[PDB]
DNA sequence: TCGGACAAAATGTTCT
DNA sequence: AAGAACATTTTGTCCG
């Protein structure tokens, strides 16, 4: 009911629409706006844990989207 | 060979006894100088090339133990 | 070579 | 729920 659902943090509210931490709200919106192109050193499927979010921002991007995260939300 | 034995970019030289870049040199003394107890968010084989080497900590100072890089070469 | 200082990238928190 | 400003962490380059 307060997690995260991106990285199961402490999470602060609802953000984009999805329940998330505040590090995973402003990752989020970068990932989106800036130009990286992530890619994953593994397997396209790393744990992504308070600690381990910052290892893999392919994963992390991923799960922001499947979750179903998106900018323009409150429209 | 002109090639970093951890993570495959332009070595620049022979550092804590092996042809590694000026990135992992100064990785590698950080880690051996300071903490590393980094956490692997795959299975410990992420793979450590120049844009993903960033991705995985724990999986570069693997890397660079193996290699056999260690403080001590010089003397 | 090795290492300090500087610089940049990447991430996270506070405040409105 | 949203984003600007600041702060920290992590990483990389220069060394007129
Ligand atoms: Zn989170
Ligand atoms: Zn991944
Ligand atoms: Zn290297
Ligand atoms: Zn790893």
Same sequence: chains 1, 2.
């Avoid at 505040?22 to 990752?27: A, E, I, N, Q, R």
Wanted: glycine share 8%.
């Amino acid at each position: 009911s307060h997690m995260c659902l991106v990285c199961s943090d402490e999470a602060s509210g609802c953000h984009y629409g999805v329940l998330t931490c505040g590090s995973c709200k402003v990752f989020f919106k970068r990932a989106v706006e800036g130009q990286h192109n992530y890619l994953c050193a593994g397997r396209n499927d790393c744990i992504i844990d308070k600690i381990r979010r910052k290892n893999c921002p392919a994963c992390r991007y991923r799960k922001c989207l499947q979750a179903g995260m998106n900018l323009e939300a409150r429209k």
